[PDB]
């Protein structure tokens, strides 16, 4: 599973696209992360999102 660092960097990479919809898996192979804005917090401007209370993450297992 990716570290906090790597999830935060992924959020950084996909800040323009980040949605209430689940993101693509952060990787093609192996274990990666998926992220989304909590549907409750969609009103907030992106640059102000709290990492703990406003974003959700889950592991995505892929081909090794």
């Amino acid at each position, epitope marked *: 599973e990716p570290s906090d660092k790597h999830i935060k960097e992924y959020l950084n990479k996909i800040q323009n696209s980040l949605s209430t919809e689940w993101s693509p898996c952060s990787v093609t192979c192996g274990n990666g992360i998926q992220v989304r804005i909590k549907p409750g917090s969609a009103n907030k*401007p992106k640059d102000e999102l709290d*990492y703990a209370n406003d974003i959700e993450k889950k592991i995505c297992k892929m081909e090794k």
Partner: antibody, heavy 122, light 109 residues
Framework: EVQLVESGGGLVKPGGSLRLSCAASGFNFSTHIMNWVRQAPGKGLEWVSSISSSGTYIYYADSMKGRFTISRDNPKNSLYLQMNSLRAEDTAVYYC???????????????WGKGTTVAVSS | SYVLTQPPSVSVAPGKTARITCGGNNIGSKSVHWHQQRPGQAPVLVVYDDKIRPSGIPERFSGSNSGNTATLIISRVEAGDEADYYCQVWHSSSDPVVFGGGTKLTVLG
């Protein structure tokens, strides 16, 4: 291009005051984190302050809270730094800077202005 | 109170690799960004998140980060790369922007 143009610097006495302005062009100003960073002569960069899009989240460097106040005017595309009770050690070039990311946990500065010069001397 | 340590000065001959180190406790667990300050001009972000070049930065700029030492590597260095380079990280909520002391890269042209 993205353009950040600082003004309002000058030479003042200790205990003096200045107001810096940064005029932003070339991007959605209303959506981006904005920042001030200074560099004293022959010293390195030192962050001053950051402000979120809506002005809700504002951080300061410990050495400057209370004396410096950051603010912005999104309709005017402008960032301000109010500097009061200036000290000799506040002599530096002050840069305006845009950042991408999330102010509360992961942001980085990606475009800087050329700076405006502040001098404080007895 | 988090400290980022850089050598004050690195000189290099044109065409060779310039390497600028940035030491910090567990810096490998942090994202490292690098800013270039050519003399007189606006600083430029050359690398962010350890190793990502923003659009417009030549491919000869690369970064590394592991353990306690991050490095900015400038291959095939040019006279125009002569600058003061600063590493930078986020330490905490109350310490969100920490700069190294800066390395002045001299290109011996």
């Amino acid at each position: 291009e993205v353009q950040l143009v600082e003004s309002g610097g000058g030479l003042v006495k200790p205990g003096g005051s200045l107001r810096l302005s940064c005029a932003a062009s070339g991007f959605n100003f209303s959506t981006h984190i904005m920042n001030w960073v200074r560099q004293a002569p022959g010293k390195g960069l030192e962050w001053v302050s950051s402000i979120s899009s809506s002005g809700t989240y504002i951080y300061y460097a410990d050495s400057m809270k209370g004396r410096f106040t950051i603010s912005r005017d999104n309709p005017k595309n402008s960032l301000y730094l109010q500097m009061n009770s200036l000290r000799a050690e506040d002599t530096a070039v002050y840069y305006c800077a845009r950042a991408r990311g999330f102010i509360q946990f992961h942001y980085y500065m990606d475009v800087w202005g050329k700076g405006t010069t502040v001098a404080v001397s007895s | 109170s988090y400290v980022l340590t850089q050598p004050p000065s690195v000189s290099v001959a044109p065409g060779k690799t310039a390497r600028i180190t940035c030491g910090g406790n567990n810096i490998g667990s942090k994202s490292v960004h690098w800013h270039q300050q050519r003399p007189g001009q606006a600083p430029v972000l050359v690398v962010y998140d350890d190793k990502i070049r923003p659009s417009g930065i030549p491919e000869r700029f690369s970064g590394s980060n592991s353990g306690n030492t991050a490095t900015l590597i400038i291959s095939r260095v040019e006279a125009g790369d002569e600058a003061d380079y600063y590493c930078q990280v986020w330490h905490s909520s109350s310490d969100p922007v920490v700069f190294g002391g800066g390395t002045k890269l001299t290109v011996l042209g």
